[PDB]
Amino acid sequence: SYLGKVYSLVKQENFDGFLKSAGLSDDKIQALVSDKPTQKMEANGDSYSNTSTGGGGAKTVSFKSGVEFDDVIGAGDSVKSMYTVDGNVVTHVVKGDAGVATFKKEYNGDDLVVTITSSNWDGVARRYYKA
């Protein structure tokens, strides 16, 4: 049901904490926390496409479930990303110089909840989006 819908950020918790654990610069942290991103996912048979707007601009990237690839996320951070698509749960594992982070995306109707964990901190961050 989530395919083709645009989800917009409505609220977030502990996101600043998570970014600190990532060792990002203060200006990047400020820009990310102030962003009001949107995201739309599409299925293309063999691959999926994710279109995002906000900080770091507008982009559409394609990927296959289970395959790692070189990527750039956030405000220009270089990482190795790997997404696993399993029904209504999309898990994005990212490996960067700072460590590893997991972004668990759960879709339920018009709501999308993203739970984020990091290898450098014990807190849990949440991003709530609505279509």
Ligand X SMILES: CCCCCCCCCCCCCCCC(=O)O
Give the binding site for ligand X (CB under 6 A): 22, 73-74, 77, 79, 94, 96, 98-101, 103, 105, 114, 118-120, 127
For residues 124 and 14, give the distance between their C-alpha atoms in angstroms, rounded to a whole number. Answer: 7
Q: Which tokens sit at 51? A: 């279109």
For residues 131 and 30, give the distance between their C-alpha atoms in angstroms, rounded to a whole number. Answer: 25
Q: Is 126 annotated as a binding residue?
A: no
Q: Which is nearer to ligand X, 50 or 64 (CB)?
A: 50
- At its nearest, how many Å lie between ligand X and the CB of residue 47? 19
DSSP secondary structure letters along 75-124: TTEEEEEEEEEETTEEEEEEEETTEEEEEEEEEETTEEEEEEEETTEEEE
- At its nearest, how many Å lie between ligand X and the CB of residue 68? 14
Q: Is 127 annotated as a binding residue?
A: yes
- At its nearest, how many Å lie between ligand X and the CB of residue 67? 18
Q: Is 129 annotated as a binding residue?
A: yes
Start-to-end CA distance of the chain, whole Å, equals 11
Q: Which is nearer to ligand X, 61 or 98 (CB)?
A: 98
For residues 127 and 19, give the distance between their C-alpha atoms in angstroms, rounded to a whole number. Answer: 13
Q: Which is nearer to ligand X, 79 or 82 (CB)?
A: 79
Q: Which is nearer to ligand X, 45 or 99 (CB)?
A: 99
Binding site listing for hexadecanoate: 39, 127-129
